[PDB]
Design a protein around this ligand. Structure first.
Ligand code: HEC
Ligand code: HEM
Ligand code: HEM
Ligand SMILES: COc1c(O)c(C)c(C/C=C(\C)CC/C=C(\C)CC/C=C(/C)CC/C=C(\C)CC/C=C(\C)CCC=C(C)C)c(O)c1OC
Lengths: 238, 76, 21, 64, 44, 373, 98, 48, 38
C-alpha cells in the first residue's frame, strides 16, 4: 500500500503548536459534512472552549443539537436540547444502524481517527485527497472508490469533499484541499486536546533539565575531583 | 565493612581538597585526546558487527521490495 | 624513612579568596 | 481552482513524474491490451503516484 | 565414582519413595480422574 | 539505630569499587523507574475501570478530563519502555563484565526479568484496545502449546472460552499486584549482592580501592536519574507515540483482527524466535530459553578472567551477539515473507550458538594464548 | 606464533594498566589459596599494581608507553604457586572419588 | 504396633508416603460420609 | 559565602527564597519563549 508522504504541517513542529483557526475550520467541516455518518464520541462541546470557540459560541453550538435524557415521570426517552457537558452527536443509534446506512460498512468513530491510523494525519489527508480512478483491471461493490491509500484501495466511504462542499465561515476559500487540511488538523486536535500544552511542558522541561544537568554534573565533578586527583605512590620500605 | 576489606602495605596515597583544585582541569585539553584514544582501542571490536547489521538490514529491505515487485515475465 | 619523597605536585589540578571559591 | 490540482500539475511536469507516468502509461496499455495478463497498474500506479504525491506534498502546503 | 555410586544406592529407595510420595500427592491434589478413575474410588 | 543501620549499611558506608563506569548506574535507574511506574500506576488506578464496556472510555476520560491525566498515562507507558531499556542495558552489563558469577544475584535477576515481562504484558492488555485484545489472545494461545494440560491452563487464565471481561479484570488485579512482588524480589536482589559487593569493569578484586557511596556514587546516581528523566520527558512531551502502536487507539473488536499484529518492541527479540521455529511448541520453548539461556550463563564461564576488558575475541563475539539481538528485534517487526524469515531462522541459530558454544570455546582459546591452559 | 602472541598481548590491554598476567586471574578458591601462599613482597606488589590499575580505570587513563608491561618482561609469579593448589586440590578430589 | 513404626514411620519418606495415600483416600470417605450425614440431617428438605 | 554559604541554616534560607522567585521567573520567561516559538 502507498505510504502517505510527509506533509509540512505546523503542529508537526517540535516546539510548534496547532493552528487553532484551522481546528475551528475543521470542526466546521465535521459539523456539516462528515458528522452524519461518523461518530466523535469522545469529544464534547466542553472540550472546545478555549481552543476554537468561546463559552457562548460553544454553548450556541451545543444548543444546536438536541439530546435524549428520558427521566420523565413516564417519559423515558425525553429528548432535551443538549448542553456543553453533552458529547458530540452520534451518526447512528447502534453499530447495526451504521452497517445499514453505510452499505454494510462501519464508519469508525473519528474521536481518535488519526491516533488510530498508522500513517497518522498524513494518511487521512492522503486519502481524503486520495480517491482515485481504479487502475485498469479492478472493480468494487458499493460506494467503494479505488483509494490507493485505503487498505485494499476499496473504501466504502464515498468521496465526501467536493470542492466548495461547505462554506467556511471565515471565508477562506473552501477548496477541497483547504478543507482536507483543516479537517486533518481538527481530527488531530481531538486525538490530542493537549498537543499545545504538552509542548509547553516540554519547553519548560527542556529548560529546567538544561540548568539542572550541567550543575549536577559539576557537583558530580566536585565530589569526584578528590579521587580524580588522588595520586598513589608505592613505597616499599626496601 | 571498611577496615576489614583488604590488606595493603606501604601504599601511600596523596590527594587534594575539592575546593583547592580546578573543577575541570584541562577538560577539553586532554579529554578530547583521551576520548579519541579510547575510541581507537575499541572501534575495531565494536563497529564491524553493526556495519554488517546495516548491510543486512538494507539488503533485507531491498530484497523484500524486489520480492514484492511484480514479475514482468509473469502475466505475459 | 618518611621524608625522602615529597607530596607529588597537583599543580595541574590546583586551582591557582577561599571564601569565594 | 483547487490548489491540489495546481501543485500536482507542476509536480507531474517533473521529469520524474513524466517518466514514472510513462511506465504507468505503458502499463495501462499492456494491462488493457493483453488478454493473457490479468495484471494491473495498481502495482505500478502507486510507484508513479508515490513519486507524484511525494513531490506534490513537498510543495503542496505552500499554496494551502 | 565408586563412593558416589554406593551412596546413590543408599538414597535410591528413599529418593524414589519421596518421588513416589509426590506423584501420589500430585494425582490426589490434581484429582487426575484418569489415574484415579481406574482406582477403585470414584469421584462420580 | 536499627533502622538507620541497614540504610547506612546499604547506601552510605557501603564499600563500592572506585572505578565502576556509568553502566553501573543503570540498576539504580531501574529501581527509580519501578517507583515511577508504581506512582504513575497508582494515579492511573484512581480513574481506570477494569470493565470491557468502560475500559477504553476510562482511558480516554483519563487523557481528556482528568487534570494532567494524559501526562501520567504517557509517563506510565514511556516509563515501561524506559524500564525495558534500562533492563536490557543492565543485563548487557552483567553479561559483558562477568557479573553472572554472582550466581544467586543473577538468578534473582532472571526471576525479576520474568516478573517484569509478565507485568508489562498484562499492563499492555489493560487499556482494552484493538491491539491489546489481539495481543492477549495471541500469547494466551501460546500456553495452549503445552502438551497435555495446555488447553485447561489457557482457559483458566482467560477465565472463559476466550479472553473477555473475565480476563481484563483478573489482568488488572495481577498487573496491580506484581510490581510489589518485584520490589520485594529487588530487596532480595540487593541483599544477595551486598554479601559479595559489586563488580568492577576490570573484573579484578577491588578490595584495595573502595570508596564510600554517599558522596561518590550517590551524586552519580542523581546525575544518571536526571539524564534518564531528561530522556523520559523528551519521550513523553515531544514524541509520545514513537514507541507505541497506532492500532491500540481503536477499541477492541473481536470480529476484526488488526492485520498487522506485532508485540511491543522489547518483546520482539522473543517474537522473532517464536516465529522462527516451525513447531509451535518448539517456538514456545525456544522463546522461554531465550530468556532462560541467561540463567544458564554462569555455568558456561570457562575463562580464568572474570571480565571482558582483557578478552578481545570474546568481546567480538559479545558485540556480534548484541548485533543479532538487534537483528531479531528488527525481524520481529517485519512481516512473514521472504527473506525476513530466513534471517530470523539464522539469527536465532546464531544467537543460541554464540551463547552456548562459541563463547566458552573462545574463552578456552584466550586462556591458551596467555599460556594458562 | 611468538609475534602473534605479542600482538595479542598488546590487544588484550592489561599491560597498559601496568598489570601482570597473573593479576588478571579471577579469584576462585584455588586462586585465593595460591595468593595466600605468596611471599609478602610479591603480594604487596600485586596489591599495589591492582590498586593502580583501578585508579587508572577510574580516571579512564592508561600508563605512558614506557611504563607499560612488556610481554617479555611479565612474570608468571602466581603460576608456580597455583599449580600446586590445583595439584593438591585434585589429589584430594581423587582420594574422595576412590 | 511396632510394624507400623518399623515399616511406615521409620523411613521419613514412607511417613510421607502413608500420609499421601491416606490423604488420597480420606477425601473420598469424609466427603461421602459427611455428604450422607448431611443428607440424612436434611433428609426431606432438598432438591431431589 | 559569608551570608548563605557559611552555615547550613543560612544556606537553607536562600534556597527557599530563591526557589520561591525562580518559579514565577522561569514560567514568565517560558511564556516569552513559548509564545515566541508559537
Ligand atoms: C455520507 C457518508 C460519509 C461522509 C460524509 C464521510 N465519511 Fe468517512 N467513512 C464512511 C464509511 C461508510 C466508512 C467505512 C468504510 C470502510 O471502512 O470501508 C468511512 C471511513 C473513514 C475512515 C477510515 C479509513 C481507514 O483507514 O480505515 C476515515 C479516516 C474517514 N472515513 C474520514 C472522513 C473525513 C475526514 C470526512 C469528512 C471531512 C469523512 N470521512 C466523511 C462514510 C462517510
Ligand atoms: C503497582 C504498580 C502499577 C500500577 C498500579 C499500574 C497500573 C496500571 C493501570 C491502571 C494501567 C491502565 C491505564 C494506563 O496506564 O494506561 C496500566 C497500564 C500499563 N502499565 Fe501499569 N501499573 C503498574 C506498574 C507497571 C509497571 C512496573 C510496568 C512496566 C513493567 C507497567 C506497564 C504498563 C503498561 C505498558 C501499560 C499500558 C500503557 C498503555 O495503556 O498504553 N505498569 N498500569
Ligand atoms: C528488577 C530490576 C532490577 C533492579 C532494580 C536491579 C537493581 C540492581 C542494583 C541496585 C544493583 C546494585 C548496583 C548495581 O546495579 O550495579 C544490581 C546489581 C546487579 N544486578 Fe541487578 N537489578 C535488576 C535486574 C537484574 C537482572 C535481570 C539481572 C540479571 C541479568 C541483574 C543482575 C545484576 C548483577 C549481576 C548485579 C551485580 C552487578 C555488579 O556489581 O557488577 N539485575 N542490581
Ligand atoms: C554498590 O552500590 C550500590 C548499592 O550498594 C545500592 C544499595 C544501590 C541501590 C540504590 C538504588 C537507588 C537503586 C534502587 C534500590 C532499591 C532498593 C529499589 C527500591 C524500590 C522499590 C520499589 C522496592 C545501587 O544502585 C548501587 O550502585 C549505584
Amino acid at each position: 500500500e502507498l505510504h502517505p508522504p510527509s506533509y509540512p504541517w505546523s503542529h508537526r513542529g517540535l516546539l510548534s503548536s496547532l493552528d487553532h483557526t484551522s481546528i475551528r475550520r475543521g470542526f466546521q467541516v465535521y459539523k456539516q459534512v462528515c458528522s452524519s455518518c461518523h461518530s466523535m464520541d469522545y469529544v464534547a462541546y466542553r472540550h472546545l472552549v478555549g481552543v476554537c470557540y468561546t463559552e457562548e459560541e460553544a454553548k450556541a453550538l451545543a444548543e444546536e443539537v438536541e439530546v435524549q435524557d428520558g427521566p420523565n415521570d413516564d417519559g423515558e426517552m425525553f429528548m432535551r436540547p443538549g448542553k456543553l457537558s453533552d458529547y458530540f452527536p452520534k451518526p447512528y443509534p447502534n453499530p447495526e444502524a451504521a452497517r445499514a446506512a453505510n452499505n454494510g460498512a462501519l464508519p469508525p468513530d473519528l474521536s481518535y481517527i488519526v491516533r488510530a491510523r498508522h500513517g497518522g494525519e498524513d494518511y487521512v489527508f492522503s486519502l481524503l485527497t486520495g480517491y482515485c480512478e481504479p487502475p485498469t483491471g479492478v472493480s468494487l461493490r458499493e460506494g467503494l472508490y479505488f483509494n490507493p491509500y485505503f487498505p485494499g484501495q476499496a473504501i466504502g466511504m464515498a468521496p465526501p469533499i467536493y470542492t466548495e462542499v461547505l462554506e467556511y465561515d471565515d471565508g477562506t476559500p473552501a477548496t477541497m484541499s483547504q478543507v482536507a487540511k483543516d479537517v486533518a488538523t481538527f481530527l488531530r486536535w481531538a486525538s490530542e486536546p493537549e498537543h499545545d500544552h504538552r509542548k509547553r511542558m516540554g519547553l519548560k522541561m527542556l529548560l529546567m533539565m538544561g540548568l539542572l544537568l550541567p550543575l549536577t554534573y559539576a557537583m558530580k565533578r566536585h565530589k569526584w575531583s578528590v579521587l580524580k586527583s588522588r595520586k598513589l605512590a608505592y613505597r616499599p620500605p626496601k | 565493612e571498611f577496615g576489614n576489606l583488604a590488606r595493603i602495605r606501604h601504599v601511600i596515597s596523596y590527594s587534594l581538597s575539592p575546593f583547592e583544585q580546578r573543577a575541570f582541569p584541562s577538560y577539553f585539553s586532554k579529554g578530547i585526546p583521551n576520548v579519541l584514544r579510547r575510541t581507537r582501542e575499541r572501534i575495531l571490536r565494536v563497529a564491524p558487527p553493526f556495519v554488517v547489521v546495516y548491510l543486512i538490514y538494507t539488503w533485507g529491505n531491498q530484497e523484500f521490495e524486489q520480492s514484492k515487485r511484480k514479475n514482468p515475465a509473469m502475466y505475459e | 624513612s618518611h621524608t625522602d619523597v615529597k607530596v607529588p605536585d597537583f599543580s595541574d589540578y590546583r586551582r591557582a579568596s577561599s571564601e569565594a571559591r | 481552482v483547487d490548489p491540489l490540482t495546481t501543485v500536482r500539475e507542476h509536480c507531474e511536469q517533473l521529469e520524474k513524474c513524466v517518466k514514472a507516468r510513462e511506465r504507468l502509461e505503458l502499463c495501462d496499455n499492456r494491462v488493457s491490451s493483453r488478454s493473457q495478463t490479468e495484471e494491473d497498474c495498481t502495482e505500478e500506479l502507486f510507484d508513479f503516484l508515490h513519486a507524484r504525491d511525494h513531490c506534490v506534498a513537498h510543495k503542496l502546503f505552500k499554496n494551502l | 565414582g565408586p563412593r558416589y555410586r554406593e551412596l546413590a544406592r543408599n538414597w535410591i529407595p528413599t529418593a524414589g519413595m519421596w518421588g513416589t510420595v509426590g506423584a501420589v500427592g500430585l494425582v490426589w491434589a490434581t484429582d487426575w480422574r484418569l489415574i484415579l478413575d481406574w482406582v477403585p474410588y470414584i469421584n462420580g | 539505630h536499627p533502622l538507620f543501620k541497614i540504610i547506612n549499611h546499604s547506601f552510605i558506608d557501603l564499600p563500592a569499587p572506585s572505578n565502576i563506569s556509568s553502566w553501573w548506574n543503570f540498576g539504580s535507574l531501574l529501581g527509580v523507574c519501578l517507583m515511577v511506574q508504581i506512582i504513575t500506576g497508582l494515579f492511573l488506578a484512581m480513574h481506570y475501570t477494569s470493565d470491557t464496556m468502560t475500559a477504553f472510555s476510562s482511558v480516554t476520560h483519563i487523557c481528556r478530563d482528568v487534570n494532567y491525566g494524559w501526562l501520567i498515562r504517557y509517563m506510565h507507558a514511556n516509563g515501561a519502555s524506559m524500564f525495558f531499556i534500562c533492563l536490557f542495558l543492565h543485563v548487557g552489563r552483567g553479561l559483558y563484565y562477568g557479573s553472572y558469577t554472582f550466581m544467586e544475584t543473577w538468578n534473582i535477576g532472571v526471576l525479576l526479568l520474568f516478573a517484569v515481562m509478565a507485568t508489562a504484558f498484562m499492563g499492555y492488555v489493560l487499556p482494552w484496545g484493538q491491539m491489546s485484545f489481539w495481543g492477549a489472545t495471541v500469547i494466551t494461545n501460546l500456553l495452549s502449546a503445552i502438551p497435555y494440560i495446555g488447553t485447561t491452563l489457557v482457559e483458566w487464565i482467560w477465565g472463559g472460552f476466550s479472553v473477555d471481561k473475565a480476563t481484563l479484570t483478573r489482568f488488572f488485579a495481577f498487573h496491580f499486584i506484581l510490581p510489589f512482588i518485584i520490589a520485594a524480589l529487588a530487596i532480595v536482589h540487593l541483599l544477595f549482592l551486598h554479601e559479595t559487593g559489586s563488580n568492577n569493569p576490570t573484573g579484578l578484586n577491588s578490595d584495595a580501592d573502595k570508596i564510600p557511596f554517599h558522596p561518590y556514587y550517590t551524586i552519580k546516581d542523581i546525575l544518571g536519574i536526571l539524564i534518564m528523566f531528561l530522556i523520559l520527558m523528551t519521550l513523553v512531551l515531544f514524541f509520545p507515540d514513537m514507541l507505541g502502536d497506532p492500532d491500540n487507539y481503536m477499541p477492541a473488536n473481536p470480529l476484526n483482527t488488526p492485520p498487522h499484529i506485532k508485540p511491543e518492541w522489547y518483546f520482539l527479540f522473543a517474537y522473532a524466535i517464536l516465529r522462527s521455529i516451525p513447531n509451535k511448541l518448539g517456538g514456545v520453548l525456544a522463546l522461554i530459553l531465550s530468556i532462560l539461556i541467561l540463567a544458564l550463563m554462569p555455568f558456561l564461564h570457562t575463562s580464568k578472567q572474570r571480565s571482558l576488558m582483557f578478552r578481545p575475541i570474546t568481546q567480538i563475539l559479545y558485540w556480534i551477539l548484541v548485533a543479532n539481538l538487534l537483528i531479531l528485534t528488527w525481524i520481529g517487526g517485519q512481516p512473514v515473507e521472504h527473506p525476513f524469515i530466513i534471517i530470523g531462522q539464522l539469527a536465532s541459530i546464531s544467537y543460541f550458538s554464540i551463547i552456548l558454544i562459541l563463547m566458552p570455546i573462545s574463552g578456552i582459546i584466550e586462556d591458551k594464548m596467555l599460556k594458562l591452559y | 606464533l611468538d609475534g602473534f602472541r605479542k600482538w595479542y598481548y598488546n590487544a588484550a590491554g592489561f599491560n597498559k594498566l601496568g598489570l601482570m598476567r597473573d593479576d588478571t586471574l579471577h579469584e576462585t578458591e584455588d586462586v585465593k589459596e595460591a595468593i595466600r601462599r605468596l611471599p609478602e613482597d610479591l603480594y604487596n606488589d600485586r596489591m599495589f599494581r591492582i590498586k593502580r590499575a583501578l585508579d587508572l580505570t577510574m580516571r579512564h587513563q592508561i600508563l605512558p608507553k614506557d611504563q607499560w608491561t612488556k610481554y617479555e618482561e611479565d612474570k608468571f609469579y602466581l603460576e608456580p604457586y597455583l599449580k600446586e593448589v590445583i595439584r593438591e586440590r585434585k589429589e584430594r578430589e581423587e582420594w574422595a572419588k576412590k | 504396633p511396632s510394624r507400623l513404626y518399623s515399616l511406615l514411620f521409620r523411613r521419613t519418606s514412607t511417613f510421607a508416603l502413608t500420609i499421601a495415600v491416606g490423604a488420597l483416600f480420606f477425601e473420598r470417605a469424609f466427603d461421602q460420609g459427611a455428604d450422607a450425614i448431611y443428607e440424612h440431617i436434611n433428609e426431606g428438605k432438598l432438591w431431589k
